[PDB]
Design a protein around this nucleic acid. Structure first.
Ligand code: UTP
Ligand code: CA
Ligand code: CA
Length: 1118
DNA sequence: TAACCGCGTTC
DNA sequence: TCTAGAACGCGGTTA
């Protein structure tokens, strides 16, 4: 009977919408049609589609499912329109010769909730002979609304459950319509996604609502201009503690409406009225802020709600507003007897996010986490503003925010508006164009397009294609509760992913010679391949004819000469070329090249239409054999287990009464212990080579969806490379032009990077839980192929140069300056073709060794005729040459360090900085600052020994800081440097049984500040390591730095018990710090970045105060 | 020592 | 309910 609540919400939403200018519009009647050819003559209204929501409508007894669509018109007004559409799923049969039987069974069995029945045909990619036109026969079950559809699923669950079970026991001497139901299908499609897909409607497009439906107005090009408001709030706060919406009250609310700034103040907390002021952190971001000082907090909550009602925003944007700002304003509204939904139409949703019917809530944080590609350390509003808006916003320590309401109130106003300027323009520059454009192709509304996982976005895109090609959707994948290998229970199953190598360490610089030993057979091969490789660079890499180039031979001769010189002088000590090569969209292009897609992976049971590809399976299993497993369970059955507290009338249940999941949880725990006793090992690992069949004839709907999105991405990655090149030839004097070029660059890279995460997710999606297109084989094939390609490239670079570091699809290397480099073909059109020889020599080899010659495509669909061709879309790309590269080395002999290095441009600026602490969220501030100081110094010096000598100067300076027990440092700089901040992904309660510095810090912080400091997840534990108790585990000597900001009685009490020293009177933070700990951690960074690499390049220890690992001293001593 | 865990990276 | 993947570094505990 839940329809009541739903039908109620519909009326509430209807009146809220009408208050905000969204009245239900019904188009005039029209007999005939010009069928979208002359829309101007069909009566109705034109609007820009800005939102959509599933609703329930009435006849105008049960509700009628429909979708509301919210439009902005061309006359400055708004309106909504409603489409009704019967929900439906399918029933499949195990014998299509009796489909009519099931029809009469379900017609009567589901008669309580069924509206209509119908037999339809779709294409099943899991059905034999489906490539010849055979189709699966199905019964389409339609309903008046989604509640009825659900009742049908409930009534149908037994039939499917019993049929999977065996038959009952009647006349054992004897030797049906229910068992004809094999499965239900397409039952879990969100209703509004279903309407968007079946009706081809998309938010962000222009339509004309007519009686015969929405007609797309392909003439309108640009988006409408929705009213857009972004807001932030500031609240009071107990010292060292978190805001409490039950106690703490809202001090101010700053916001921005279409570029106008406003600030509301609670004068009961703000010491004085605020005057209108301007914060324009850069000319591109204006900000004139009008003030609304109000008497009490309630007055502030009521002006905000009224201002919102007046301006009518169809977009409201925040930064983490879903889990801080909105629930604060909501609780403060409740306390003061105010109802947020009746005032502004906003309320929490089933996930606790704050949503509205007429207005999308665009929480910019969600874009940052999903689409920005920023490291976690740079995902705060400050770091984002620096990266994406190009300026430093106002920063105020939060402990100073409550008092500065009284002492320095205008300052606290400026910070408040600073967060509002940054949020508004972050939205309009980055989030608004991306999300509203993405809605034009993905069938979600703006709120869901912003928030859903990128694997789900992929699934949305894939479902559109499958529907439009009349392909029946597979049900969501479900992996089994137990898997077995060679009789062992498996703990983990996966494939071998990317191939990573650390090959050299140390400093490499464009002005410092290096020794190269060049393989003469390599130059022989390159010389043999050269005429065709250059023909490949022209014809394939540049889509042009060799007949229209006019300097082919001159380039062939010039390249050949340098090659022949390298073959005669194999040994050389020259200046290096620090180059990088990476395959563009490697896994997508491997997939599209090999025509990889989950429906294409066949067993011997079905199906040269077949291309065999190899992958590497890796399993992790217990060493226990099934004999031991069966024993462990039986024991568990004889034991007794507690019960869920429904009633607690029965307070014990047997093992076999536990859910199958909870059963194996106990089996798993018990089995780990048995293996540790009888085997002394818990998990065993094994890799197996596997070969899968990839049909090259399968319906390529998945492969083609990937191609489309890759090409969609390539647009922006190419505009990015264009505008980057423009900025190369803008006169340094022309500031405005250079500023505009850079702005274009940062936008297009952001757009290409946001498309990147969806693109790569088309690969991850085949391994995602709940995937409608799951295939481990396809993922494992993708990876092994990529490992084979990059290792082929490494083999060649090895023989003509020195590869430095290698990761999945990319190689950093140095090559002799004398190696053939960059050339420019010339055409009769006067145009030039770029050529980088090191890129093309690889690409000609990739296309020689990894092209799919068995690619097949339907040429004549009516007669089912296929035409085979060759396909290869895999290409390395080149960037460089660079001024410097710095690769660290491990403290452990023979090992490398992967995924960490610094790279510098010729202009001296940082090109890349991968992996290091400096960039990761948290870590120990000292190591962060030391790293930031050291990397630029590697460019100084005139020789390899002087470069290291210069860096060494910075080290010994940093060492003096800690050898002096922090005496050379003021207190402010001391707390910052020696602190370490770590994050707790869950709450402390869920870490029970584990020891960590974050765990210890959380516990101590809870005892001192109360339990309410642990209640939530994501807690930031800021600690220092104390000297005492001496020789104790570091996890036991971890003090939260908040104690040092507490009252002396508190400080001594906790510091005494934390150090196990009840005589402690001396609370100076300097005396508590375990300086030998930090001295060793700083020293450990120094070895890996400076001293041990220097040794590997034959340079005596530049920092003698950091002693070499014993193994190195021995090797040094030969 | 080697296995193993939580976090946050590079792909 | 909703949910892209594997390989790796590093401080830290534990067999
Ligand atoms: O977030 C990510 C990044 C990378 N990857 C995986 O790493 C592979 C190589 O990582 P890359 O960063 O090189 O990505 P890419 O080749 O797809 O894109 P561009 O170089 O053109 O910028 C990708 O093909 C993908 O499979 C992910 O799965 N997820
Ligand atoms: Ca790249
Ligand atoms: Ca790549």
């Amino acid at each position: 009977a839940l329809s009541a609540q739903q039908l109620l919400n519909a009326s509430k939403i209807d009146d809220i919408d009408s208050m905000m200018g969204f009245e239900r519009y019904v188009p005039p009647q029209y007999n005939g049609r010009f069928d979208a050819k002359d829309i101007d003559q069909i009566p109705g209204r034109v609007g820009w589609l800005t939102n959509m929501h599933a609703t329930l409508v009435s006849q105008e007894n049960q509700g009628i499912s429909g979708v509301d669509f919210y439009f902005l018109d061309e006359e400055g007004g708004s309106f909504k329109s409603t489409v009704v559409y019967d929900p439906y799923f399918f029933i499949a049969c195990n014998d299509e010769s009796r489909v009519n039987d099931v029809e009469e069974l379900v017609k009567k069995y589901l008669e309580s909730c069924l509206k209509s029945l119908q037999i339809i045909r779709k294409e099943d990619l899991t059905m034999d002979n489906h490539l010849l036109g055979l189709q699966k026969t199905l019964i389409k079950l339609s309903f008046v609304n989604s509640n009825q559809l659900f009742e049908a699923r409930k009534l149908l669950r037994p039939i499917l459950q019993d049929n999977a079970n065996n038959n009952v026991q009647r006349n054992i001497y004897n030797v049906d319509a229910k068992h004809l139901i094999e499965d239900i299908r397409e039952y879990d499609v969100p209703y509004h996604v279903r309407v968007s897909i079946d009706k081809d409607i998309r938010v962000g497009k222009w339509y004309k609502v007519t009686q015969q439906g929405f007609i797309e107005d392909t003439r309108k090009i640009a988006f409408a201009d929705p009213v857009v408001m972004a807001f932030a709030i500031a609240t009071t706060k107990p010292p060292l503690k978190f805001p409490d919406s039950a106690v703490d009250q809202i001090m101010m609310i700053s916001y921005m409406i279409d570029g106008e700034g406003f600030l509301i103040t609670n004068r009961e907390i703000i010491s004085e009225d605020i005057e209108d002021f301007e914060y324009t952190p850069k000319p591109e971001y204006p900000g004139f802020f009008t003030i609304f000082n109000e008497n009490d907090e309630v007055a502030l909550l009521q002006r905000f709600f009224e201002h919102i009602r007046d301006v009518r925003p169809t977009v409201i944007s925040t930064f983490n507003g879903d889990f801080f700002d909105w629930p604060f304003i909501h609780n403060r509204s409740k306390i003061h007897g105010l109802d947020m939904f009746d005032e502004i139409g906003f309320a929490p949703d089933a996930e606790g996010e704050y949503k509205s019917s007429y207005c999308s809530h665009m929480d910019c944080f969600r874009w940052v986490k999903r689409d920005s590609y920023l490291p976690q350390g740079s995902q705060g509003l400050k770091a984002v503003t620096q990266s994406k808006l190009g300026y430093n916003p106002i920063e105020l320590d939060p402990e100073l925010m409550t008092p500065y309401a009284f002492e320095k109130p205008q300052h606290l106003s400026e910070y408040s508006v600073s967060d509002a300027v940054a949020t508004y323009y972050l939205y309009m520059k980055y989030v608004h164009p991306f999300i509203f454009s993405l809605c034009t192709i993905i069938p979600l509304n703006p709120d869901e397009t912003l928030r859903k996982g990128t694997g789900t976005l992929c699934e949305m895109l894939l479902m559109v294609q499958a529907y439009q090609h009349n392909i029946l959707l597979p049900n969501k994948h479900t992996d089994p509760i137990e898997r077995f290998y060679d009789g062992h229970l498996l703990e983990s199953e996966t494939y071998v992913g990317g191939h990573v190598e650390s090959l050299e360490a140390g400093v490499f610089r464009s002005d410092l010679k290096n020794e190269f030993k060049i393989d003469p057979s390599a130059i022989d091969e390159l010389l043999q391949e050269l005429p065709e490789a250059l023909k490949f660079s022209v014809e394939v890499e540049n889509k042009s004819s060799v007949d229209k180039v006019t300097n082919f031979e001159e380039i062939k001769n010039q390249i050949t000469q340098k090659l022949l010189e390298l073959k005669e002088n194999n040994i050389r000590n020259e200046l290096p070329l620090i180059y990088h090569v990476d395959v563009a969209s490697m896994y997508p292009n491997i997939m599209t090249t090999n025509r990889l897609q989950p429906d294409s992976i066949k067993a011997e049971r079905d199906c040269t239409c077949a291309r065999k590809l190899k992958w590497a399976w890796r399993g992790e299993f217990f060493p226990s054999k099934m004999d031991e497993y069966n024993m462990i369970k039986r024991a568990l059955q004889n034991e007794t287990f507690p019960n869920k507290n429904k009633f607690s009338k029965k307070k014990v249940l047997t093992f076999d009464e536990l859910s199958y999941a909870d059963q194996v949880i106990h089996i798993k725990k018990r089995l780990t212990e048995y293996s540790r006793k009888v085997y002394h090992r818990v998990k065993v690992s094994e890799i197996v080579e596997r070969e899968a069949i990839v049909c090259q004839r399968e319906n390529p709907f998945y492969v083609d969806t990937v191609k489309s999105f890759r090409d969609r991405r390539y647009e922006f990655k190419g505009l990015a490379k264009t505008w980057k090149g423009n900025l190369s030839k803008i006169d340094p004097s022309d500031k405005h032009a250079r500023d505009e070029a850079k702005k274009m660059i940062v936008l297009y890279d952001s757009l290409q990077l946001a498309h990147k995460v969806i693109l790569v997710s088309f690969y991850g999606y085949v391994m995602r839980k709940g995937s409608r297109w799951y295939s481990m084989e396809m993922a494992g094939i993708t990876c092994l192929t990529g490992a084979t390609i990059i290792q082929m490239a490494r083999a060649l670079v090895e023989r003509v140069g020195r590869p430095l570091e290698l990761d999945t699809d990319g190689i950093w290397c140095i090559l002799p300056k004398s190696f053939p480099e960059t050339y420019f073909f010339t055409l009769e059109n006067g145009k030039k073709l770029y050529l980088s020889y090191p890129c093309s020599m690889l690409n000609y080899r990739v296309h020689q060794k990894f092209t799919n010659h068995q690619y097949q495509e339907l040429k004549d669909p009516l007669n089912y005729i296929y035409e085979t061709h060759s396909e290869n879309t895999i290409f390395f790309e080149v960037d460089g040459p660079y001024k410097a590269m710095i690769l660290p080395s491990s403290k452990e002999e023979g090992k490398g360090i992967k995924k960490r290095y610094a790279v510098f441009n010729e202009d001296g600026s940082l090109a890349e900085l991968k992996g290091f602490e400096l960039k990761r969220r948290g870590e120990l501030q000292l190591i962060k600052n030391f790293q930031s100081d050291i990397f630029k110094v590697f460019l100084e010096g005139d020789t390899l020994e002087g470069c290291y000598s210069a860096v060494a100067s910075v080290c010994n300076r940093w060492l003096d800081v800690l050898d002096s027990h922090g005496l050379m440092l003021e207190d402010e700089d001391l707390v910052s440097l020696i602190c370490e901040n770590r994050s707790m992904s869950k709450t402390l309660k869920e870490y029970e049984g584990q020891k960590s510095t974050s765990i210890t810090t959380a516990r101590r912080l809870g005892d001192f500040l109360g339990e309410d400091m642990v209640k939530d997840k994501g807690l930031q534990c800021k600690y220092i390591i104390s000297s005492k108790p001496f020789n104790a585990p570091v996890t036991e000597r971890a003090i939260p730095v908040a104690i040092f900001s507490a009252d002396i009685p508190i400080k001594r009490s906790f510091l005494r018990r934390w150090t196990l020293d009840p005589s402690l009177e001396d609370l100076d933070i300097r005396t508590i710090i375990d300086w030998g700990y930090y001295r060793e951690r700083l020293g450990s960074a120094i070895q890996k970045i400076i001293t041990i690499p220097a040794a590997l390049q034959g340079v005596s220890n530049p920092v003698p105060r950091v002693e070499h690992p014993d193994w190195l001293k021995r090797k040094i001593a030969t």
